[model samples]
Target: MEFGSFLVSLGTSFVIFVILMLLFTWLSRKSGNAPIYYPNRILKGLEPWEGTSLTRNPFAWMREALTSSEQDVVNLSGVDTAVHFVFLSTVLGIFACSSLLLLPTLLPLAATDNNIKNTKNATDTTSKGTFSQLDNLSMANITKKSSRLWAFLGAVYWISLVTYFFLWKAYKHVSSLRAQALMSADVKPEQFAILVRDMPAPPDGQTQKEFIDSYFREIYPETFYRSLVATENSKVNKIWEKLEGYKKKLARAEAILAATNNRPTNKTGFCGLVGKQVDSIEYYTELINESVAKLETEQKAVLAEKQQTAAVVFFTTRVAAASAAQSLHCQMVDKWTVTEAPEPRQLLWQNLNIKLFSRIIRQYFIYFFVAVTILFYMIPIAFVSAITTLKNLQRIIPFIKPVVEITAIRTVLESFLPQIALIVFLAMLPKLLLFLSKAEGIPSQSHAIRAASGKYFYFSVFNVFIGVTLAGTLFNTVKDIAKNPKLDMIINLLATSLPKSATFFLTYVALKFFIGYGLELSRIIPLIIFHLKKKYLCKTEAEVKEAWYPGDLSYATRVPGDMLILTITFCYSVIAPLILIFGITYFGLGWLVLRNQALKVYVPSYESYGRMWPHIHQRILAALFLFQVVMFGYLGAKTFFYTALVIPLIITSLIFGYVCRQKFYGGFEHTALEVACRELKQSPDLEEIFRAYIPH
Candidate 1:
């Protein structure tokens, strides 16, 4: 089968790619002369940041991605990474049997002689190789409407059973991982604390901290350890910011002086060119000291204030912390707010001080904007595809008419040009969503990523999954979507257009597999940018560190992309089995590449400790539910008596999903009090902690 060939090619290419990656990483480390090598430390998987490791080899990382035993991922990345990996593997494992059964059973059913004769050849002129594999896997090949629908309907429960089994495993895995991580000796202060905000303007003249202390002393007398009211560090932050710039310039000037044995000079004010000339090193040294003195004064001024309204309340017992965080101390209408705090590094201090009721309102307002954005974003992409038709290309921009006439240029216009805007827009969406999340006044960056992940997934599904496919046939769809505007209508349009859009998606999947993965493998962009910066912009040793910065495994992009693939998998599994073959390839290869990158390159900005699993689980169930509905519609369209069977499967998806939510959602949603208590080892110095907590 062509399936084996594609798998072989992909597998073979990956092996070769891995060998090259190994060779490059090794040589770059051993022989520092290598152009792509980073003299700055690459984060070693399972290890904390040391700022100076030359190369990272993640041989231990691959195995850890496979199971609960992945200590490095569990201990280092937080159990969340391990839970995600387990979720992915569990989905892949279950689908392996689903694909095997369906390919054999459904392929033969849909391939009955009726389809062979009606099947379209690869092209108008040639029968070369575009055999209608899609026809072999769709409801279109059914010759008659009858009780045979029962056979396919039975496939639903089979899938449902497998789904529940995997979901049960994932749900358990996430909870167990949380317990294990919490029970481990790795617990920190934030794990046993609650963040409370909006203090009702406190007593007439009392400071925020004193009011919190006095109030909690009344209620939680024995358990209340202390409260650290938040403060504004904007003045110190501004001064420090200028101080860093001065140091950077001084270092750069020193480097230049060392190279040429001549001191670099600059104007004393407003970006070197506009002010009186001064010796750059002396100027910066005095400026640094002056800024430091000002910073000391600013810190004193900050401590002198009554304080910002928000405060973090600490407890000696985990039960006390968790119980207080989980319940409200004030009336529903009151301003006082309490909730489980984020880890120290993960805090979004400025936004954290806001009232929770306003945050909830902001979240809903964002939901409306995000929904409108998802729908309206499709418009520009639609325009890109619609206007790029060869005829419209000539009509819209006549200046390039001669170039457009050439076959090569014409091909580019017809194909690559349209995807450019989409490609750019999609690449930008993570940041866009992140910004939107922050705009919603979300409490933490990690929380924003969680929110943004959902938004990006919806946008991608509506726009990328449905958007790219329907862009051409959109004339037939937009009218229905616009008028009816329902989920069922969308799914109906989705089922109708799915087969028609098969070839395009097939191509899109291929481009992503080879081209997208290829770019990641090559590291051409990072490599070039690194060397260019080092050659033109070197200064202090610390400055070289900027050239090799690698970002974290962004859940905002990664989690949604993974779920989107599963969505693609479930949708096309019955309609076009070829997509599953690519889906398998995509995940299989992705598992390898992503594991390597996570082990070596990606550095997590913050850890959610596997809280993201519930969303992933929910999305997978939704996809299965959609798949069941699609089958129901297709069978009913054939007037099959057994179409009724799928209804039960539909009910099961929702019923079981809700059951899972009720039973298992509790564990990840709240940190256990016992686990929190064990981690309450010591309290940090509030002055230093609050100083570090301040936003830049």
Candidate 2:
């Protein structure tokens, strides 16, 4: 791509970002829109906009985000957002430091290579050929068997060291944050609970609860407080949810009546459309009582016949709960299986009763879906990358050949459409993967999210980053096969086209972060949808809550996209160096935009005690490892004498990962007994607390 085309891409994305920001800042000031823009603050009962001029100032939220401390982030948004910021800041640090070191050395070194002379003579033809002047600043510009290759070799090693340094430091910092959170005085119900599954049948004379109480009291008479046996509550849950909505509708109607001295009325049919009209407040109150009556009968039936083999046992102290979770409870090995409980909000009640064989079946079913997704999902990406280039666009769709000759049209197609196409394709997959993850019988929402994130990371690295690289190279080389179809020609294409592929990713990162941060900060869809819902769809307080519910940070999609940028940055930091600029931009904007959202927009659904750090750390190491291997391969193809030297960097990266895991991975897995045993000033009543975890 030409520099002018690159400029056009940057300009377009920047303009969109500006427009979105202006709209967001202006619209968010409206008092009615506070639920959409500042849901977290509103949920926490803080004044969403205070003291500051709401209409006159656009940077108020930005300023607040910048001034807020880490503790404020933890208190308002929870630990998950804090950990996410750590990941973003770490990425920013790595690329910023690497850019400082590599760009000055590699850019000038490659620009001054002997290949520059050969390229300048055919500059016109070169731009139209496989190599552009952009390649002049890449490792591709270095002549084979030249001494200049040694500089890039050292650059790779330096970047690896820089990457490892940041990751190790971040791992330790995030681990401490996890430990601190675990040791804090907060009285989460999960801290004093253990989930016991696969319980044996009760004795002939005893009920299931009686047997559980006896078994635990025998083992931990002083520490065991209570047990709540699991049951089939899917049917009960539906009615309970509806009853809760009825309460909300009643509240909305009562509030209206109090203010206006008039009773609100609506139809007694679906969505108030076609049935006998009734007073809204009276109708919902009657519905609530009816549900309550039916629920009482359903609960009695469930207690008698719907019991499962799983139960949550509460302990008098966190240490007791931790010990019970870690120890083997029965000789049968599978009878009284115990594990640390997930947060009540994280529970997947429907999956709790899945048997071992059923879990295995669902696991494999998801694996099949994942395999099919990974293998075939690249067809669209390959097709998009193949046709979006100017030459490919003209060749594939000859009807637009004349239209694309205009620089404006050509630039948009080549530089903008392809990236957006790829972005939209990726956006479609995260929810599907999340659904597949839930199908695998993961017993908690947090675990399912982690599983989906893992799947997405692998899929994206293989398809978006690696697949597009190879596909673009294949398209560039297809005509060569007709004249001279040889293995060496194919091998040479792979070697030459890989480095040039960075240019595509450079613009992609530029477009992606700009538009992504814009949409996130502006929240265009949510704002518009919230208004639409409030005007047309919402008829109750519950429905209004659902309308403007700023959801949790979706790690499944965010983590993989960030990791992809890091991979692109690492792969091209030495070869192109310019990508480091965009890598820095990606995380810099992410940190700023996300900090604001975490402070006001998003409400964390659950906390994992910073367990996500290990995943982020390992992905960065993998990116570095891939970088080392790419350098070795590219340098070896150049016939450099000391190309084998890059092998040690690869080994060192793997060793670094192993070492980090050994040092810090344990803290994320389980809280230490020492931390759990610490005393707090106040004690929680287990009798009242355990009731919250039980299904209604």
Candidate 3:
């Protein structure tokens, strides 16, 4: 094994990247977006001079970023709550520590250029390609002299220990933050309320109110305050809202007419321009009067039908309510569904009146459709990859043969086309996932993001990871196996292609990390859209805000991208040590840029108080599994016996993730009895306050 052969290319690449990072960061600030570009500094009110900010000193800014208080983070943006910071820091911390260990110890110990070139001229191109720090470390250079797996064997367990241990610490840090955040903030009724859905209809002769009152009162004792059952009048509510809008316009017109000569008029038709002009001031007056009278009549009729199965039960204390929410109140699980009540504004008030069966069916339908779309999505990526080669692509479209013979055009098309195909596909999925997440009738916007985030991560894992290596091989592998038919032959064919495909992943990391993040730094699309909308559309403060709004860290997209990066890192870390450096660069730069963005650029629409962290944590574990299995497969391809060792390591890492979650995840979801009781004793008048949580 030799070191520093690719060092020249690596150093040149590093210089180019550092220059780009500096250039874009300067541009972000030059755009007068310093606050957004340097959120941790903005949050800290840092300055080189008395009047300046933390941006001047790169080292100072980084220091402040690393040590920003929890309140500073929460104050910067609720979306950048402490849990998010923990995830960002923890993941980077793991990699940082990983680089520290691997680079100095394992990586340099095995780094060489001549190893793969000398070892395998027999297999032709499969084992031969441009190589990296890892090719020298693996069996490729072992020369049948020493055991290749021994050091990797030790390194795998060591990496697992370092990773899993940090995860545990990270979980504890976030759990503690959740507790502290609750105690510091004022206690809203949502802190002491639970939403109970799917209650059975009034038993035998009991009135709906009386039935709910008696059952909850018995279970909750003195802890129960009151229950507000959702009314089956959402249709009427819609009418009443229109009625209110009309009244508001009528009043505005009357006020204007009394004060000045600018009298209002409109056509009395579908869009006000389709019919003859009329005196709108008098017309709106008549319209509002009739609308109000009719809506009142309808409101009373709908109120009489108020018997929704869902209810918001307010308790005297948060812990008492949390206990009820988290506990199984009845023997039949499906009959009574209890959960922490979302903020009153977050609920689909109409969906509360919906029958429970319909909602369940909606969820299942969403899941099934998404599952189908995922499989089909992979087929798109396969088509994208299969075309870059001159053989199949030329056959498919003979018209392109003239263009293909030109070497420069062929190279550029092959490189960018496949990349753009994946980039476009990955880009389109998040919004659709977010829509379906809403279609599932989410209790809050935060939960909706969480749901969508899960799907986004799922999409990447399926379409990118499994579909990339396995897709193009299965047809020929299956046919060959069918021809000869032996288990050894089958394993060899499947595993043989994996190491070669490591080169594809190398290109993937290069494109996704460098260009994708560079796009983020340039803010090309976002900046163009911002200016275009501001120039052509922005009128009011709200409209302008929409135009420039940096928007919250959309976990649906961000989490999946990070998860995919980590998956790629873990996928190649053992087989290609150079990948770790790129991964570290991406995450490290990402942490700083995002911290600044969170502080100044992003306008948080809503906060689930870091409920999205679990998705990140879970995705990470899934990446770990993917990484380790790829390790097993790559090593097994080198020789079957080493595969024996890594299989259990993968299984153990998975179980370890599960066990860690079971231990600490509860702390994130529910408040403790000790914490809840202190605020419980300060029960202020809720009959007025409780109305905030009630459906109209």
The most accurate candidate by TM-score is 2
> 633-663, model 1: which lDDT tens digit per residue?
6666555455677888889889999999898
Q: What is the TM-score of each candidate against the true structure?
A: 0.81, 0.90, 0.79
In model 2, where is the ten-residue run with the lowest total lDDT? 119-128
Worst 10 residues of 3 by lDDT: 1-10
Per-residue CA lDDT of model 3 for 1-696, tens digit only, reads 112212322344455566666766566645365433543344446531226554455344456566667678786566335576677678788777777766665565455423455533533434323344434643244332235456665666667777888888887777666677666656676776788887888747666777789898998788898888776766787887887777766765665666566887778778766988888788888888898788878866764533678788888867778788888987987676888888775666655644566778889999999999998897896776554333334545479788867655665655556667877888999899989988875667777877888888788787887787565344223333434535445443543334334445655566666655556655656766655655452321232333454655677688777777777777656655556777787787787766655654555656566666766777787778777777776565554467788878888987888797798776767667767766444556676658986555
Q: Model 2: how far is 413 from its true place, Å?
A: 2.4
- Clash pairs, candidate 2, are none
In model 3, residue pairs whose N, Cα or C atoms come closer than 3 Å (at least 3 residues apart or on different chains), thus clashing, are: 2-111, 2-112, 39-596
Which model, 1 or 3, shows the larger TM-score? 1
The number of clashing residue pairs in model 3 is: 3
TM-score ranking, best first = 2, 1, 3
The model with the greatest lDDT is 2
- Misplaced by over 4 Å in model 1 are 1-30, 33-69, 113-139, 144-152, 267-278, 303-307, 381-420, 468-496, 539-544, 638-642, 678-696
lDDT of 2 by residue, 163-196 (tens): 8898888888898788777777477788889888
Model 2, runs deviating above 4 Å:
1-4, 28-33, 49-60, 114-127, 202-206, 246-288, 393-408, 482-496, 535-547
List clashing residue pairs in candidate 1: none
